[PDB]
Every structure is written in C-alpha cells, then in structure tokens.
Symmetry: C3
C-alpha cells in the first residue's frame, strides 16, 4: 500500500523504459559478438552503454537514480553465469561456434529490467546449429516459453518447476539444480518469492511454495545444462557483488569503511562488478573485509563439466491484469536450431502452442 507497484501508471512507465534500454544494449552486444572479440571489451561496452542510455532519459527529473541493475556478464560454453572480468584477470576471446550467454540489467528509479540471451558465435549463413548446442538452447528457450505461459496470477511456482523439468528432459537436458527466479520490487533484485529450478530434496523442503498474484513483477531466469546440471566453483575470481541491506557490522578498518562507502553511494543495493572501480588493487582489498562478514553477497562464477553447454534465457514480466506483459527478451530465432528431439508430452505440447 506504501509500496510503488505496477498498479500505478508511472511505475509501468519506468519498467517499460528500462526494458527498452536493456533490449537495445543486449542486441548491440550480440551484433558485436564474433570470432576474436574480447569479452572484457563487451562487458565494458555494455556497462558504458547502459549508463549512456539511462543518461539520455527522464532528464527533467534530476533526483531520479538510474543505471546498471546487473553488470554485463558474458558466460561462454560450460560457464553458467557472472563472468565480468577485471582488467587484470585472464580475458576470454570468442571462438567460432562458442555458445555465448549475455546477462544484464537496467533500472530507472529502482524498477529493475533484467534480460539474458543465448546465441552461437559466427554461425555460417544458411546453416543450423545442431547437436548438444541445439538441444540445450531449444530446451532453455521452451522452458522460457512455458514460464511465460505459466507465471500468471493464480498459478503456483511449483507448476513452473515441474514444467521446466519435463521440457528440459525432452532434450535429455537438465535445469541447473537450485537456481532461483526472483520477484522484483523497487530497489530489490532478489525478492524472497521465488521459482526454483530442479531442486534437490533438501532444496524442495527449504524452498517456499508460492502463488503468483496480479501486480507482481518477476525476473524469470532459465539456466539449462546439456550435462548433469550441478554448477561447481572452479577458482575463477568472483568480480560481482551485491550489498546485503539485512546485515549491519561496523568495519574494523579505514580502507574497508571507505570501499563499503563507495559501494553504497555508487550502487546502493544493486549488483556491481569490481571492474567498475577506477583503482583495481584498492577495490580487491576493500572487498575481503566486507565479503567475509557478509555485508556483500558474492555472485560466483560456476561451471558445468568441460564439453557440456549451459543455455540461458532471462526475461522480466509484469503480471498485468490483461495478462503477463514481457518487457525484455533476446533476439531468438527458432529456425536456427535443429534438434533430433522434441516435446512428446501432450499437455506441454499444447501449452507451448497456447
């Protein structure tokens, strides 16, 4: 009732204007993605381009905070998520046939527009992607299609969790264990009402059954693996952090209090990459105190087993009265992907046509 919701016209407007920016930046990055291109440069180019487009809009309103809601992340092949390298980490260079996931977020007055898309580097004109890339992309895309049709008022998060497994299984792929699609609110990317992928027995017990309601907003995030689908750390350095507002702890230092002060000014409660910090070695230091006492929440770089592919589609959807209204999406082309398998289940075939 105090809360600013998509029940209000001005809020739909901010969501729609960040959505349009998220869609433009994503597409620009996909067009710039070819053999020999630096991932570091695409992460920099996206974060810069988010800032510049947020710069040009709502100029009359000089108090409104706007920018990055999720820093541009570029996770290739069996890498799951959250790769925004530092100027001094090893870079990754896109090879032909590389499977690329681009993930990013934009906000306007704290209303968050999250988008992620998967494609293949320099697919030869007149060909189709085939084999396990085709199987896992096709599968993740149909998972996003089933969620667009199931995440609506009156349905339960559990029905989406199950639809996802039957769809992914149809391609002998596997939704990554325990990943979460969060409810969004003003200034909150990580709402506690969630959809869980492919939960274990522990995760199924600890995760809360919920019913979607009109006026809620979700960042639906589909991550599907060609393999077993349990992501592991593999000592890549975490660059992406979020401040956790739920945690106080006075910091016994000078640098730490000073780094965690630039995190609050420049970013408040949104995720940020350690690369966005002018002076690298100084940020690398101010993080350790903060991260161990949980004031910052890490976004770790997880990997599936070498040779396997992970595909991603993330879209932000507003549960408007008239029906779910999608405000971000990638330039997916269904005809580019040939799989030898399809969905055989009659209920899911009919749902995906609906």
């Amino acid at each position: 009732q105090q809360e600013q919701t998509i029940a209000e016209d001005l809020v739909v407007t901010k969501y729609k204007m960040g959505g349009d920016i998220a869609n433009r930046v994503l597409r620009s990055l996909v067009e710039a993605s070819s053999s020999g291109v630096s991932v570091l440069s695409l992460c920099e180019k996206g974060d810069a381009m988010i800032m510049e487009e947020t710069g040009k809009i709502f100029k009359k309103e000089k108090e409104m905070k706007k920018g990055i809601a999720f820093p541009t992340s570029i996770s290739v092949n069996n890498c799951v998520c959250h790769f925004s390298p530092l100027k001094s980490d090893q870079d990754y260079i896109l090879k032909e046939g590389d499977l690329v996931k681009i993930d990013l977020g934009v906000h306007v007055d704290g209303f968050i527009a999250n988008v992620a898309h998967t494609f293949v580097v320099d697919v030869a004109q007149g060909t189709q992607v085939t084999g396990r890339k085709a199987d896992v992309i096709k599968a993740a895309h149909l998972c996003a299609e089933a969620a667009l049709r199931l995440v609506k008022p009156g349905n339960q998060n559990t029905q989406v969790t199950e639809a996802w497994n039957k769809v992914a299984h149809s391609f002998n792929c596997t939704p990554i264990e325990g990943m979460l699609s969060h409810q969004l609110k003003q200034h909150v990317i990580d709402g506690e009402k969630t959809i869980i992928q492919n939960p274990t027995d522990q995760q199924k017990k600890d995760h809360e059954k919920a019913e979607f309601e009109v006026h809620e907003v979700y960042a639906v995030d589909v991550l599907v693996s060609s393999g077993e689908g349990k992501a592991k750390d593999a000592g890549q350095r975490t660059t992406i952090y979020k401040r956790d507002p739920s945690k106080q702890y006075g910091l016994k230092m000078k640098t730490s209090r000073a780094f965690f002060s630039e995190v609050e000014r420049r970013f408040d409660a949104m995720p940020f990459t350690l690369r966005a910090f002018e002076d690298e070695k100084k940020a690398r230091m101010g993080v350790v105190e903060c991260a161990k006492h949980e004031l910052l929440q890490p976004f770790n770089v997880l990997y599936e087993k070498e040779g396997e592919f992970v595909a991603q589609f993330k879209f932000t959807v507003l549960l408007m009265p008239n029906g779910p209204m999608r405000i971000t999406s990638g330039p997916f082309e269904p005809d580019l992907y040939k799989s030898e398998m399809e969905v055989q289940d009659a209920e899911l075939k009919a749902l995906l046509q609906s």
Copy 2:
C-alpha cells in the same frame, strides 16, 4: 456494488477462466475422432474444467470456481445443448461429422464461454468441401465481423445486419431469434443482447442497445445451411439454470433436497442432470422445480436433417484499448474450401481489419 472490468482483480479472474476454457476446448477437439462417445467427451470436459479450476487461486480457499456452462457436443443439424445422461442415448462420432463443442468456465462468478466447430477426422492434406465448408466459413467470418463490430459506441443492430450479409454470401442463414448475452458476475444471461436474423415479431420483442466500455459479451454465432429455424424434436433437456428472480416453498421431499443440491453446487450457473449421484431422482425433482419457473431449461433444438449448423462463441471484454477476446476455438481457415466468398466491398474491408 457490481464488480466490473474497471477493477484489475476482475479482468484477472476473466483471463484465468478463459485460459482454462481455451485449454479444455482444444483438449476435447484433439480427443474427437471416429468411434468416440459424445457422452465421454462431455464427462471429460466437465472433469477437466473441475481439475483446472481446482489448481488456481488455492491460497483463496473460499473462492467459488468451476463450470459456467457444462460441455455440450451438438453434431450436424443439432444446434446446441446436447449433454446426454448416462441413462439416455449416447452418440458415436463418424468421419465427416460436423461437431460444435460449447462449454464455459467461471472464477468467482466471472464467466468465460467458448464454442468451436470442426469436422471429424479430416484426412491429412484434404480440405473440407461443400455445404460443411460454406457454413463453417460463414459462421467464422460472422465471428470475425462481430469481434470488430462489438465495440463501445456501436449498436447491437449493426452486428445483426453484418451477420445477415456475411452468411448470405455463403447461401447460409443465421438461426433466427438466437441471443448473444452481456455477462456480469454470477450472470450468464444478461438482458442486454445481440439477436440473430430476427423475425418482425422478434425485432419488436428485442431492445436496440449500444455497447459500452467495461462490458463483457459472450458473442455466439450459430449459422445454418438451411431455413435457419431451430425446432424442438423432443430430445430430453439435460441442462437447466436456477432463476434467482423467483421463490416457491416447493413442498414434495425429493423436490426440495434436489433444488437444495442445485443451490449448494451450481448456485446460478447452468448444470447437467448427468452431474447427479442419481439421474432418475434428478429427472423427477426437476419436473416440480421447472413447472414453477425456478429452473429455465436449455433445450436441444434441431434444424432439418441433411443440413448443418456451425457455431463459434467467444467471450470479449470491451476494454479501453479495444475488444480483448479471452476465448476462441483453434480455427485453421486453410482446412475449408468454398466455391463462394464474401464479395461486399465494405465487409471485405472490415474483415481485413
């Protein structure tokens, strides 16, 4: 007082009911082929509506939800409302039978009604041909015309008149007298109506009306290859509705615990006698209740034999942005080849949009 589609929660309830009506409808059309029992299709629909409405808005333990119009499957010259009792005659679908499937869903009284015509087992790569195609094309283009004419500021009469020229283009006739009703919460049979191809008496019996924003209509197209009169052929009537504008103490003991059941289970929504524990006790307790006008019947009317009746029924919300259709059959216009076409310049332009 009246809850209208100017409330965000009401639109939501209409859409969740239509998503369900659309799903049960298609699942019934997939299940329809040579040798399946209409009885079992009617049982399957009604059970799918109850399962689907069972799964939604479950945090809201108190909310009524379920059948707004029990599944009816009216074949060839049958016009509507055929939902056989288990103890009556069944009907087995044949190849080339023209099938109308009518059903409705409600969520907290907000009704989503749909109906659709197809032909049984159309051989792959074949096209329906002849009178069946004429009348299915006609009824559909009558629905396309209504979708574009049922909008705020227009009159019911403009819709009546467009249906007459669209259906004459295929030498078909809208069945005279048939009504398309305004819907409101708990009301399937609003007084505000679109009439088809009315007689001079029916014209004077029926009120010109103007569509207004925030209204809901179950638009209902029934077009015949014949006459366009629908006559009783004494099939037993299986579908009745409580008439909430009516009292009567009733007296006979079966009668009162019968009508006690229709009030507990179905409140104001149409129901089939097939839905009772004992179809015989139900046929008996109706006979008192219906005489005294506490139940309206939904009669099975029939055209002349060898003639064909097509139906498309969709529920539409007159939203500010434009008509928002929440139900529809899966129409494929490529299935149907007619030697005739709509040729009126002004209706061709309407249908193109």
Copy 3:
C-alpha cells in the same frame, strides 16, 4: 478538469475515432486512380467521416463528433491543405502522381489524425523507383523512427535529430519548421511540439520538451526530395479553424450566419469552405471573420516544380505499456525501391526494434 488518456472513457473515444480515420483513409486510397477528380475524393472522405461518426454513441445526444481535419489531397510537390472549392481548378489524378491524403476524426473533441502517401496506378508487380521511392521511404522510416522515440522520458529534440539523419540517407530533407502537436480534448494544436529541421532562428523560438505518460501526439512527417522549403503560391486558401480565444460581434448579417454555421458544424476544428452551399456568402463571411482574427488560415504550400513531398501522419497515445498508435495508412514497403539505405548502425537497429 482536463480529460486525459488516464480515463478509460477518453481512451475509448480516441480508439473509436482512430478506427474511423483508418477506414476512411483506406477507402480513399482504394478509390484513387487515373481520372479521379481530387474534388470528388475530398467530398467523398468528408461525407464518409460524417456517415461513420453519425452511427456511433447515438444514445449520448449532447456528444459532438465528426471531422477534425477536412480531407486534403496534396499531389506531387504540393505540401498540404488542398481541399478545393467546387468552383476552383480541380486536379485530375494521373498515373505516377505521388498523392498525400490527410484527414482527421473527433469523437467528443478527442482527435484522431492520419496521413498517408502512395503513387497512383502503380503497374501490377513493378516497384516505384527514383525520387518518389527515395522520399516515400525516407518519410516512412522517419515515421517509424518517431513511433519508437516519441515515448515517456525522451526529448522532442532526439526525434528532430533522428529525422535529419534518416532523411539525409536518401538525399531528402524534412521541410524546415513543420510541427507535430500534442492533442487534448477540443485542441488540434497544443503548444508542446516536435519541430522538423528547424532554421538557425526556429531553434531559438521552439521549446525543448520531455514526453510524459498520458500525453497524445499527432506525429506529422513531411519530407521533400528538394531543399525542404515550402512557399505560398496564391492558390485560394479553403481551410480555416476558429480561434476560440478571440470573440467579436460581427457587423454584417451574412457574417453572423457564417459564424453560426461554423460554430455549429465544426466547433473549433479545421473545416473546408467547400462545405458551405452558398460559396459566395462564405467567401464574404470569411473576410469579415479572418479580418478580425476569428479564423486562422491553413494555407496551401508548395515545394519547387519537379520535386516530390511525402507525408506519414499518425496519432499515438503514450500509455504506461508503451506508445499505442490508433491511426496509420496501409504502407507496403516492398513497393518502393531506392539505390540508397539507412547506414547508421544505431538508426538501423532502432528501425528494426
């Protein structure tokens, strides 16, 4: 007090007028070919707007509705406002003529403006080529760019800038100083505007502005193959509107009758003098009115001989969910072939979004 698209009923009236402007424009486009009197097309289009508005919202008796901009048919290097008197030189359409059709509808003073460019009797399965295709493609890609840029948070200036880049790609120029007005109830000419290719001086005078939800714009793209200037040519002016801010008791009695017929038939919307039966009394009524600033003239304007001007106008509502276009013409892009194309990477991507 002011009625905005935040009201369900306002959005409805805009949509009902848009639906009509679309129907009329298309009918006029179909009716344009070699030998067609431009006078007849102006008559036909004004008569259609009155017939179509005559049929809607009949039960609301006090509700004013009809023409927001009289059908104007501006050919080749004519820019705008050609609506000849019965007694003027008529223009007969020739094969290969570039035609601009511009008209408006109002429902209760909610305005739906549209304009469309096409080429007369394009040879079946050819393509228009040369300057006519250059300028029609430039104007359409300008209209497409406006539709994606005129939205809450953006600046009228970014549109102005996109329009010189997009048009320069075809060696075409948006006509210097032409305006796209905000619309409100009974106001065709709101002060918040998008300016085309402003002069030196015009930039000083024109206000920068941010677009916001709930605003309405009649986006008017006017593009020239030549310099992008538009001069008078003492062609009779025929279109005027009443300035509702000026009031004056008139001396002569023909003048007052003239005024009464203007106020009654056209409130404060532009009208053509062609709509007055007594052509003489009206030309005399005007000079007393126009003398005392009671009418503002809409003068006919021309680019140079042999040059071509294209126009796409559309009326858009900045709803919360995104711009909602309620008018458009039937553009078929595959009809126009140009040696040139938009080569800026950001405009390429903006035009595909």
